[PDB]
Swiss-Prot record, chain A:
Gene behind the chain: NDUFA8
GO cellular component: mitochondrial inner membrane; mitochondrial intermembrane space; mitochondrion; respiratory chain complex I
Domain of life the protein comes from: Eukaryota
Oligomeric and partner information: Complex I is composed of 45 different subunits.
Portion held of the full protein: 2 to 58 of 172
Residue numbers covered by motif Cx9C motif 1: 35-45
Keywords carried by this UniProt record: Disulfide bond, Electron transport, Membrane, Mitochondrion, Mitochondrion inner membrane, Repeat, Respiratory chain, Transport
Organism: Bos taurus (Bovine)
Name listed for the protein in its UniProt record: NADH dehydrogenase [ubiquinone] 1 alpha subcomplex subunit 8
Curated annotation (Swiss-Prot), chain B:
Protein name: NADH dehydrogenase [ubiquinone] 1 beta subcomplex subunit 5, mitochondrial
Subcellular location: Mitochondrion inner membrane
Keyword entries, A-Z: Electron transport, Membrane, Mitochondrion, Mitochondrion inner membrane, Respiratory chain, Transit peptide, Transmembrane, Transmembrane helix, Transport
Subunit composition and interactions: Complex I is composed of 45 different subunits.
Main location: mitochondrion
């Protein structure tokens, strides 16, 4: 068996959404309406690739 | 019975018995190969049916 390829630590850095769950809960309904397009593109990628390494972008 | 009737009746008996003997020997050989290789209709032990598998999207993506 081979070696499990993994992206570099700097290939995973990004600005995280550092707010609490009640903030997301309060914004969820408008958030779902406003950010649908990138959100659904990402979820399409995850269920098609079945590989988190393939949807990092 | 005349000697020609018995003589040619014997040939008919011999043909049937000889053919059956050949088929009996083939069956032993065919059975030996099917059991050792499992590539024939005999000794075909069941495997799980793949039409029982659910192919729809699952609750989580990695599967």
């Amino acid at each position: 068996p081979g070696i499990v390829e993994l992206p570099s630590l700097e290939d995973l850095k990004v600005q995280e959404v550092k707010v609490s769950s009640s903030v997301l809960k309060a914004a969820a309904h408008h958030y779902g309406a406003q950010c649908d397009k990138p959100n659904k593109e990402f979820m399409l990628c995850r269920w098609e690739e079945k590989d988190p390494r393939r949807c990092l972008e | 019975d005349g000697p020609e009737k018995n003589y040619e009746r014997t040939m008919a008996i011999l043909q049937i018995e000889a053919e059956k003997a050949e088929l009996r020997l083939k069956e032993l050989e065919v059975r030996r190969l099917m059991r050792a290789r499992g590539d024939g209709p005999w000794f075909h032990y069941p495997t799980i049916d793949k039409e029982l598998i659910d192919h729809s999207p699952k609750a989580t993506p990695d599967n």
